[PDB]
Amino acid sequence: ARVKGGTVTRKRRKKVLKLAKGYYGSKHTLFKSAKEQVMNSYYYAFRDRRQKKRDFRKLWIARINAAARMNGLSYSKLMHGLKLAEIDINRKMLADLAVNDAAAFTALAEQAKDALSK
Amino acid sequence: MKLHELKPAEGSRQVRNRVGRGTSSGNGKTAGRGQKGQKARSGGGVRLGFEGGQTPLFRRLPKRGFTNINRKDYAVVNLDTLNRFEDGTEVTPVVLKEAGIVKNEKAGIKVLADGELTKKLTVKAAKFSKSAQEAIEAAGGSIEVI
């Protein structure tokens, strides 16, 4: 028999337009522009789920570096000293101690400095 | 069976492949034809046996022989097929036709000595291979050219 276009076409395009809500001007309005930008958004979103892991480790290291220097030590020497002392605390936890519990961070720094001397 | 519970035998029926219905099907866009050229075109392609202008194989080779207007081809019956009849049977082109052994006798029945004959028969046929004649008579039967 004859199968006319029906409603499938509209349904499919409406899904893309919903993904494009909040985009500027025609990019949330017109299907072709919206689909092109949703594709680019997907490309960015996948790439950025990898990049966010890089960015946060970059943030923690910088914060640990600032706290390390306040304890008479560079970031690189502190991580060497913690490794020598068998401390497995990760950079997310160290950065959190650097900001929220400075006394605990100082206790870790002292253990690292002790391990470096030995 | 039930009309609301029909099921074909496994592997008896397959789904047709539709080309040019999107890229993820693997036959989207170019529909399996690749890129340009004569074979990408609608109705494109060269005739069977065309070698792009190299002299085709058949032109390279000589024509041979002729067909004989009077050529006679015989329907072949071997001895193993005559073991199907009981001892003393009269094996005839009519009998072989009724048995369904020889539906088309062509220029006639010819008997050949492929297998071993084990029953005594009086065999009637257009022609006999010398070996077939010996086997039939060695079995204590007899042959007759019709």
């Binding site: - | 069977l48 070698e51 058949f58 080779l61 024509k63 041979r64």
Partner: protein, 64 residues
């Protein structure tokens, strides 16, 4: 419509018992002074259609 046999091929090849094709030999028409006796003797013998060529011409002889 029925597929048509390639008549020129049908005049040049024969279907053998194994389903292969028996063929004559090229270079068996003239200029025999240009060929050794060994060449003439061995071109006298028939050959078969090669695998690559057979796949190209097989449809043209389906009902030969």
């Amino acid at each position: 419509p029925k597929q048509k046999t390639h008549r020129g091929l049908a005049k040049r090849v024969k279907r053998t018992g194994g389903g292969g094709l028996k063929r004559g030999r090229a270079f068996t028409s003239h200029r025999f002074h240009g060929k050794t006796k060994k060449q003439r003797r061995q071109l006298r013998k028939a050959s078969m259609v090669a695998k690559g060529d057979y796949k190209r011409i097989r449809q043209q002889l389906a009902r030969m």
